[PDB]
Design a protein around this nucleic acid. Sequence first.
RNA 1: AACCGCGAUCUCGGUGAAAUUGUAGUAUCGGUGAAGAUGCCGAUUACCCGCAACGGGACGAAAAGACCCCGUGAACCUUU
RNA 2: UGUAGGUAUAAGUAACGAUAAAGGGGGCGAGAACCCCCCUCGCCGAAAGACCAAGGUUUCCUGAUCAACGCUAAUCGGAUCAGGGUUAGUCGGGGCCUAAGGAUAAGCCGAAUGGCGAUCCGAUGGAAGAACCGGUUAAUAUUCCGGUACUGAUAC
RNA 3: ACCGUGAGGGAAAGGUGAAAAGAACCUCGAACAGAGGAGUGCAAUAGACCCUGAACCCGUCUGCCUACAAGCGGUAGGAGCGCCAGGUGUGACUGCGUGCCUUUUGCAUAAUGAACCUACGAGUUACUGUUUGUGGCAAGGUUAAUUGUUA
RNA 4: UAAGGGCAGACGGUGGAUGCCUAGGCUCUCGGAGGCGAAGAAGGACGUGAUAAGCUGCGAAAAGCUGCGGGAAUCGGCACAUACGAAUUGAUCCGCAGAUAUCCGAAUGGGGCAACCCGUCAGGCCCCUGACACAUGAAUUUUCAUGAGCGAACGCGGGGAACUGAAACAUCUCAUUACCCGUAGGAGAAGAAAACAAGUGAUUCCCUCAGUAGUGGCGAGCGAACGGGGAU
Lengths: 95, 48, 57, 103, 128
Amino acid sequence: GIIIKPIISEKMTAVTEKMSERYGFRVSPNANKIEIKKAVEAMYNVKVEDVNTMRYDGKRKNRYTKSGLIRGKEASFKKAIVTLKKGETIDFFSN
Amino acid sequence: MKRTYQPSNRKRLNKHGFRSRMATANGRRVLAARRAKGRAKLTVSDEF
Amino acid sequence: AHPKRRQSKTRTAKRRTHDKAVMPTLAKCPNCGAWHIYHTVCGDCGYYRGKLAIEKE
Amino acid sequence: SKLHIKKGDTVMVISGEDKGHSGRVLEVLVKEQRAIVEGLNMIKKHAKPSAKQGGIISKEAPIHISNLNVVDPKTGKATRIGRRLNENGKLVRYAKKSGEEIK
Amino acid sequence: ARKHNSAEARKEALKQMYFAKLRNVPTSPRKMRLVADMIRGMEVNRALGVLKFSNKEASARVEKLLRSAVANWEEKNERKAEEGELFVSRICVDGASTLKRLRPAPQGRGYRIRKRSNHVTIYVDTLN
RNA sequence: AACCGCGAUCUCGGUGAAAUUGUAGUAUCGGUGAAGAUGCCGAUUACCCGCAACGGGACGAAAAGACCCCGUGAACCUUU
RNA sequence: UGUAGGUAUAAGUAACGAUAAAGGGGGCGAGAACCCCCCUCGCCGAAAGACCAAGGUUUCCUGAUCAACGCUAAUCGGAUCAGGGUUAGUCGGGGCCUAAGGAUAAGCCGAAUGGCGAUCCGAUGGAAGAACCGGUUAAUAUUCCGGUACUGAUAC
RNA sequence: ACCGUGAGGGAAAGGUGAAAAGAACCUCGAACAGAGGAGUGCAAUAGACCCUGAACCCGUCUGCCUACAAGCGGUAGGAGCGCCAGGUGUGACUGCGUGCCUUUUGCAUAAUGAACCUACGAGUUACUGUUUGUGGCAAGGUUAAUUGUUA
RNA sequence: UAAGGGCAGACGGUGGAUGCCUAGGCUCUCGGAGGCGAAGAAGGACGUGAUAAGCUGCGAAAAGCUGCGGGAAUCGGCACAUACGAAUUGAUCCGCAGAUAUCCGAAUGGGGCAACCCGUCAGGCCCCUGACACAUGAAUUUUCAUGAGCGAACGCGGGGAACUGAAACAUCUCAUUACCCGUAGGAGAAGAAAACAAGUGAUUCCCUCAGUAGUGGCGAGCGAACGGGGAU
Ligand SMILES: [K+]
Ligand SMILES: [K+]
Ligand SMILES: [K+]
Ligand SMILES: [K+]
Ligand SMILES: [K+]
Ligand SMILES: [K+]
Ligand SMILES: [K+]
Ligand SMILES: [Mg+2]
Ligand SMILES: [Mg+2]
Ligand SMILES: [Mg+2]
Ligand SMILES: [Mg+2]
Ligand SMILES: [Mg+2]
Ligand SMILES: [Mg+2]
Ligand SMILES: [Mg+2]
Ligand SMILES: [Mg+2]
Ligand SMILES: [Mg+2]
Ligand SMILES: [Mg+2]
Ligand SMILES: [Mg+2]
Ligand SMILES: [Mg+2]
Ligand SMILES: [Mg+2]
Ligand SMILES: [Mg+2]
Ligand SMILES: [Mg+2]
Ligand SMILES: [Mg+2]
Ligand SMILES: [Mg+2]
Ligand SMILES: [Mg+2]
Ligand SMILES: [Mg+2]
Ligand SMILES: [Mg+2]
Ligand SMILES: [Mg+2]
Ligand SMILES: [Mg+2]
Ligand SMILES: [Mg+2]
Ligand SMILES: [Mg+2]
Ligand SMILES: [Mg+2]
Ligand SMILES: [Mg+2]
Ligand SMILES: [Mg+2]
Ligand SMILES: [Mg+2]
Ligand SMILES: [Mg+2]
Ligand SMILES: [Mg+2]
Ligand SMILES: [Mg+2]
Ligand SMILES: [Mg+2]
Ligand SMILES: [Mg+2]
Ligand SMILES: [Mg+2]
Ligand SMILES: [Mg+2]
Ligand SMILES: [Mg+2]
Ligand SMILES: [Mg+2]
Ligand SMILES: [Mg+2]
Ligand SMILES: [Mg+2]
Ligand code: NA
Ligand code: NA
Ligand code: NA
Ligand code: NA
Ligand code: NA
Ligand code: NA
């Protein structure tokens, strides 16, 4: 339930091309590494070897109305880089 | 030259923070007045 | 130091009498049939006094 | 509030440029109290070739519902409607001009 | 019907005028007016040369406005203009909306800066 | 006192404030006058419009004089 | 010397913020003194180079944009919009300890609100349980990878 | 929003059209930057800052005057010229004329005050007295609080 | 000859006056109601949409979940959106009753720079997560009940100015006002004669008595009661 979406980007594509056991997810900001490992294992039926995390504060943005400007903000999130055991894989395109 | 405002987050919170206001009867008076006026920023704790 | 009075529209316009944009000194170059500044290179053909000065490919 | 017309009803325009013309109701905008009557109140819209090639498109614009009256099934005329529970305990619309149940 | 009749009269009148307009040009009306006074009343081809080689910055926009006016004349008369046929029969520069800015001055004072705009109108016609 | 260099200055292109401001086609002299006149009187002088330069006047601008007096004003200080 | 808004006058005037300084050739572009590349010139060099902390908070990198902002213009920007970007058992902090001081217990004082008063809180100090070498991105690296190691708990 | 360490202080900002029908397409231009068209619409000089659209302030055109002339800029006379049938614009030349407010014995005053325009801005209300104009009753006049009916 | 200038008319520009318009204020009337909170408040933080959330709603069940009643064709909140779905086997919506309801905050397991850090005991998982319990103080006999905090005015109580007026000022006035603090209720306070008076018969409020009796550097000012008429 803590996994929100995966990370698709040029950096993640290069990382997966160079490793093939490394994937990225956007998770809830308050989940720890053990919780992330358990959620990933339950969701994909794999063996997780390592989890790296970084916390991202949401970007401040400008909401434009007819009158003028309102200062707003995007939601904060946490990035989880998950490395699996050798030979394992996860498919994002399938299903 | 040195100006009057020399920022320090620790001093700012120790002097004007929410817990500093709640620790005193007159600080709670300030909080009640600000709530009655309807301020969106109750204390310096609300700012970032 | 300070104007004792504001200037009237008449006084302002009278001073502005001599404010004018300058007309450029234009020659015709009857061969190419278009304007250019006298004593400069004709920028279209690249000629000057009937000689190719600047060649553009 | 329940309106005096509905989608699929035959209505007559009683006020405006299309006064005296009947048609079918295609959609009802309840908040604005307007309705689209098929074939009536045509407008020309200048549509950019964005699409998905542009051009001038003819389409129906909505009419205020106080300008529309249900067509009487007997005489084919605009009329005010009422409501009664004659249909097996259910409220139905009927035409005050004749009495027949609106359907 | 009153406003419809008035509009029809005005629409008929506009068919015999050949003009172009530049609106909300973000530059000084006075400096633009210098160029306008330079080219008022002048034959169109000479005016185009003068504006092309003028030493004022506003002449560049005036040149494109003049070209637009000549094109409007050509479309409304349904033919191309000949040599020396058209001349700048009217030209005016009006002031437009001002942007207001603040500039700091010594000892804590703040002064207002005005960034002015102008409109330009050009009418061409034949030297009849 | 002379000369020299650069920056400012002057001219051109671009951008573009401020203090000040009853309206002004705002000359000089001597008179007059709330007693020191661009503006009144009598004379005199003076074609229309700029630019550079200087500060005699506009009792030039600035902050409702701090000196002085006044108010049954105020504050602070002293003391038998 | 009234108030708000708008617009004048002075005026196309003062000024464009250190006198370290610029010249040329190519590129791109509708547009170039100023943008990008090259050559030459000049300035700092116990700094005007390189780091840590406070403070700031996305300003970082890329693609579009040149309206406004940038004391000029701009194709450029710390500007606008969108997307991306911060990876730790060993680095820093916290978890542990106490100083000034603060909050309190038993008690003391006091129209009220309360004022005091030895355990707790409280770093700017004391402990932390513990590495380096090399490579790699447009943007991270003692954190990712390849070696080489070490430390703490846990099941035999 | 902004300002302030903080307590706190504290704005400006409404209106297209009946309906978005919110301008397909063409022209000039690097570009809607902007405009001229076409089309929609009763109307676009209702085109997005959009109803009406004043003043100060800024322009263009047309008429008349103006480069030998000297003071609050008007006022009273008065040719010529120019427009449209006795009106209207201008004004050669002549006489007279030191703004206004306030404060003062007395101000052209070199005493005070104002850049200008639009908008805003200052003897009001209650109660109780008194005088008076006009009334009702009259050797009497008048109810207060409150109560009843329908309201 | 007009470089320029003056006046008038016409037509534009700027600017946003005026006219017209508005549910946004202001003052009231009548009838209710007069609290919310340890079963965790007021007020916030962070989240939550197919697509970023500025408001609104909602809370990991997150623009919503369940039941009963009403209703009958559209609905999926607003900031000039589309897609994609729901719905006559009755959506959406409306009334009533339920379910869920993160973190902070009296905040209550201990701390703390609000929205965080660290725990102990039992129980279910495997370093680490999910559901409990774990504050204090007056009553009660470990159990039980109450309290704490917030909040419009009106009530009661504890403290209590000054400018001002007296044409200075100290008694006096402003005023038992402003303000600070404590504490109730739908009202509160008062109330049933050791009373007023020179006959009445508990309190409270209204109209009079009356600017009267008194009081007072007898100055400025302050100012009743008995009686009578009512509400009850
Ligand atoms: K980390
Ligand atoms: K003054
Ligand atoms: K209109
Ligand atoms: K209208
Ligand atoms: K106008
Ligand atoms: K005259
Ligand atoms: K003076
Ligand atoms: Mg000049
Ligand atoms: Mg400009
Ligand atoms: Mg140039
Ligand atoms: Mg400064
Ligand atoms: Mg000079
Ligand atoms: Mg210049
Ligand atoms: Mg004299
Ligand atoms: Mg004299
Ligand atoms: Mg004078
Ligand atoms: Mg002076
Ligand atoms: Mg004085
Ligand atoms: Mg002044
Ligand atoms: Mg000057
Ligand atoms: Mg300067
Ligand atoms: Mg200069
Ligand atoms: Mg350095
Ligand atoms: Mg950058
Ligand atoms: Mg770029
Ligand atoms: Mg610029
Ligand atoms: Mg950028
Ligand atoms: Mg300790
Ligand atoms: Mg870096
Ligand atoms: Mg552009
Ligand atoms: Mg109109
Ligand atoms: Mg308008
Ligand atoms: Mg002479
Ligand atoms: Mg003459
Ligand atoms: Mg005197
Ligand atoms: Mg006099
Ligand atoms: Mg005076
Ligand atoms: Mg003055
Ligand atoms: Mg004066
Ligand atoms: Mg005035
Ligand atoms: Mg005024
Ligand atoms: Mg003229
Ligand atoms: Mg006008
Ligand atoms: Mg749940
Ligand atoms: Mg606690
Ligand atoms: Mg006194
Ligand atoms: Na640093
Ligand atoms: Na920091
Ligand atoms: Na157009
Ligand atoms: Na002034
Ligand atoms: Na002239
Ligand atoms: Na706690």
